[PDB]
Design a protein around this ligand. Structure first.
Ligand code: NAG
Ligand code: NAG
Ligand code: NAG
Lengths: 476, 466, 443
């Protein structure tokens, strides 16, 4: 009549790495690394993104006629630019501080387009009906931006223009306008009558006075002239004032903005689908339940922390064998014991049988669960971290931004990789010691029997099922 | 009988471990400072500079409302409040203002000096009429203390030319302005000439401006504007001013000394006659622990800022009035009666004691653990806030990504280090107890740690001789 | 049963105790260099020597040796790199220019506007100056052409170049601001000139201003230098009525890996290295270095540590009832003299795995040298320094604390292997005691 102390074994092929040994097969484990995505752009928590499509932000904000899809867009979760987002300023010219404008829009959660200077009434002394061009052609007729008004002279007079707008929206207002540089003096006079004109735009936080220059630039969309585009964010209660003797591409529509938290701009060619997610990358959406991911650095939503690891497997059970206990004097696990991690086997006159010690097993399960959750809890969820954009004269800032991203990426990959290596080694020694503690618990309790040596004990006396379950209960 | 056992007391202190939360321990040491004195103090005896109702612009330009600041020549740090609103009393823009503040944040002392003495520097122009209602002082039109509004003498404004070579042995902050009158009549009244220019040149700075007659909306009755400019003139370098009008000339400049411990702070807390080695905008810190969660903005030698609400490190053992079966094992509880150490013996014969040998080794080891964690933690020298204009959002967000990124790293390092070291410290005591039992067992068994043998013989067993 | 002892005096720290003598250990810190500037993976660096980048790119005549430079591994500036714009003036966006050149792997100088044929209506033979004197004769930059009037006429200049090289072309030019109206008329005839330079990504129209600046090398005038990167298929167009210091040679560029500009006075030698610092080359085999924070190549992480000694063996059970090690046992870590290859090889495999894991998870720094900020970029400069210093503290902390914690685990690791060997005879001899059969484990 014998009893043995032993541990659990199963058919698991899970391997984990530890600080002392690599690829160790264990009975239970949890993967902490997401390495897959669904290959779709999804809504974030139910809110669709804004797909700029063939338009870029400039074409969107200016109101390029090819971007009319976007005019009613007022609410989105993030902004998508594709490889075909090429429709921008149809009348050629540069947007000043374009990357800053994009950075501003990347946190916008609500966008309300309104007619800041109504076309029909704002400009009684000028002509509002002729500012169209073949460069902004739409459905076979010369056209122009939906959000700007190309004002020209009325008759043969362009009087001094002055127009103010006071923001009473209760939110900041995005105002856009332009300054036109004709290619010849004849075009200057034809459009604006006066020569040597100026355009001045002012608020309490903004001031710029421009003198348009006449220069013939290389032809883009038949245009040797240029329009330089400008924008500013007007605060509640602040007043923006336009003054011009010509060349003013006036605001027609502007946008009352609310800023949110979880949005950004993403560059992706993947398709939007009517799926939803808490975490989106340019390649596809992530499930976002594990603390780490190696799919993409650019995330939007509440996302696992990005690491360069290819695997982050955490040991929870013990070494799978189907302080000298596991693979020691107790040379192997019991696949026959299924209800727990540590337990007993007994040979009897009434028959054989495995039983698991729930007391020590639950303590081990409680401790390891606390270990895993602590590792998950100490890792922070990676709120929206989008891409950042730099112009061609910002290489040092771009490289500074790149050094930051790469430095934290190395730090977090190191911390995760070493934590799992060290915690896995400690977890296996934890189980090893609990078995050794359980072996000594019966040995220091049957001391009437002799240590067979292999985790077992031969009872020098008859020991029935009552006698067995008594030793297990700790009351023997 | 002799019993091997461990210490227990009346402590309710709890610590977290990687395996268990809320573990009551007999001894522990706080590593997280979470309180402040609500005061702005001197740094090691050095008074801060309270700008009060003035901001940096008003101080540097010399807004007449900032005259009381003129007696300040050395400070430990600079304070702006929610009411620091007195700046440019004559409206207009300060160029590269966030850079000027960045430069001044490491200045600990400066010397205001009369770079172009008003009485002698401008013989061919008028220095006696450059006042405005916009800069009123005591009910009279006035002007900046550090700039001079030069106008025409009689009906002529000749070409102005003046140089200054910095021989102060320090960088000199030079400030000036260019006036943009609102009407051609005002241009003629003040400067006679039209189509004027102002040029300012040194070996590291060059700018030629043509003033523009423009009617801006009235601020403090002024439809005109003054644009302010500054530069740091190196030792041995020369700055040259040239103008046919519209020059708001330097009158006073500042020879700067940069110090190791100083910054600009935004705070509404009051200055008091306290001193501190570590200051935040909310109040001063004691600065004894390696971590603090009061504020990211520090001045002095300060604990590292973390987001943690508790950083509790175990030094004693589980408190019971485990891994190795001794503590919370066969010895089911601690001895409140044993007070002289962590591990020891209780004996009973015909006529509690602490094992000083076993206790001292563990005390020596745990002190080393705690000290190592403190020494590896570095003092956080002065880290102030940075400022960005409304067209510097990307840089502002890059700066914030850096602050937040290192903040998350150090919060992780502190919290997880404590979580893992607490587990090892409790397992350390548990193992030291099992070793004390097995040492007695290897000499002489009831089970709970417990020939006639009096005191000489027992105390010998404690001594290890039997 | 016993453990190994030898004559090593190596000391290591652990979280629980400092200065513990160990039988074997490994240093994880490279703290020495060969005091030489070497080639990187086989590619010679570019020594600017007494020229700075401006003098190199403009083609200051004192920089003629550099004209053959087409491929380098990194660029070296010395404390005597002072030959720049010999005719005084500055490059707009000069730190950006340097940042662009810091990543260039191929450089092909070509004659964008051939001086003998590009300017038939202007004079190409008089744009020389005592300020750029060479071999006792007035001279000028090798890469720019100082065009002046032909006879008494300076007609409107118009020259385009279309980039068809299939790679970016660095184009450089200048705009001259004479000190007096007489010099303006003498050089360019016209009084109210302009220079406009345009591509699809660049446009600037400048009106030169006649101003007498302080004399630098006898020049009261100034030349403002400009640069741009012209994309494939794009056209740059120059138009001017005077004051144009025109392109003469430009540069077809290929972008390479993340090398940089180094400030160093060490001498270049015919050595090669995987990792270079301004003080000297590193062997680059260990995961950490404290030689210099400025690295180029595949380099160990920079730390503030003076020592990073990792225990691999045991202290010279241990230091308990067994009051000492056997200096006489030489064949292994544990044994009975004979060493147990099972017990010793298992520990060697594990400790070798621990050492390798610390090294394997450590990444190369791959940093960048010479981040420069102008005098109005102090906030950006301080931001860059906050990043460098912040990671320095993190890695110094991670390295030092890792070594403290793993050393304690290593010394207890050996201690437990001794107890397991000691218990190995007890679970074998049973009650037959108070040889090769016990060692084999079959007794
Ligand atoms: C284990 O056995 C089950 C059948 O019960 C089988 O489906 C599975 O593939 C086997 N292997 C693992 C690793 O679970
Ligand atoms: C979108 O969802 C609807 C209903 O869930 C489904 O009919 C449709 O196929 C989905 N995909 C589309 C519209 O591309
Ligand atoms: C500008 O100055 C000139 C002198 O050169 C004078 O004749 C003219 O009247 C002035 N113009 C105005 C508007 O004051």
């Amino acid at each position: 009549d014998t009893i043995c102390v032993g541990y659990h074994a199963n058919n698991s092929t899970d391997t984990v790495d530890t600080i002392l040994e690599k690829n160790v097969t264990v009975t239970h484990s949890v993967n902490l690394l997401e390495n897959s995505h669904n290959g779709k752009l999804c809504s974030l928590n139910g809110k669709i993104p804004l797909q700029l499509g063939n338009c870029n932000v400039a074409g969107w904000i200016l109101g390029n006629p090819k971007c009319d899809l976007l005019l009613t867009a007022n609410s989105w979760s993030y902004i998508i630019e594709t490889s075909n987002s090429k429709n921008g300023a149809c009348y050629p010219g540069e947007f000043a501080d374009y990357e800053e404008l994009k950075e501003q829009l990347s946190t916008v959660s609500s966008f309300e387009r309104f007619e800041i200077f109504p076309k029909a009434t704002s400009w009684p002394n000028h002509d509002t009906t002729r500012g169209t061009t073949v460069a902004c052609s739409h459905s076979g007729a010369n056209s122009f931006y939906r959000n700007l008004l190309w004002i020209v002279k009325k008759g043969n007079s362009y009087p001094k223009l002055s127009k103010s707008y006071t923001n009473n929206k209760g939110k900041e207002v995005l105002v856009i306008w332009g300054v036109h540089h004709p290619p010849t003096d004849s075009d200057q006079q034809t459009l604006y009558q006066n020569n040597h004109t100026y355009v001045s735009v002012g608020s309490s936080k903004y001031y710029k006075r421009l003198t348009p220059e006449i220069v013939a630039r290389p032809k883009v969309r038949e245009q040797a002239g240029r329009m330089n585009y400008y924008w500013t964010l007007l605060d509640q209660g602040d007043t923006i004032t336009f003054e011009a003797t010509g060349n003013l591409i006036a605001p027609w529509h502007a946008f009352a903005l609310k800023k949110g938290s979880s949005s950004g701009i993403m560059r992706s060619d993947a398709q939007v689908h009517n799926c939803t997610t808490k975490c989106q990358t340019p390649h596809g959406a992530l499930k976002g339940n594990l603390p780490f991911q190696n799919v993409h650095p650019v995330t939007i939503g509440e996302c696992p922390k990005y690491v360069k690891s290819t695997q982050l497997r955490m040991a929870t059970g013990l070494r799978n064998i189907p302080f000298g206990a596991i693979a020691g004097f107790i040379e192997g696990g019991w696949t026959g014991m299924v209800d727990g991690w540590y337990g007993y086997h007994h040979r009897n006159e009434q028959g054989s049988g495995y039983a698991a010690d729930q007391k020590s097993t639950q303590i081990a399960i409680d401790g390891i669960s606390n270990k895993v959750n602590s590792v998950i809890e100490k890792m922070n969820i990676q709120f929206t971290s989008v891409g950042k954009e730099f112009n061609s004269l910002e290489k040092r800032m771009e490289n500074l931004n790149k050094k930051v991203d790469d430095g934290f990426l190395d730090v977090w990959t190191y911390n995760a990789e070493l934590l799992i290596l060290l915690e896995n080694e400690r977890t296996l020694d934890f189980h090893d010691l609990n078995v050794k503690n359980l072996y000594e618990k019966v040995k220091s309790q049957l001391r009437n029997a002799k240590e067979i040596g292999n985790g077992c004990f031969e009872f020098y006396h008859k020991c029935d099922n009552e006698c067995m379950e008594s030793v297990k209960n700790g009351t023997y």
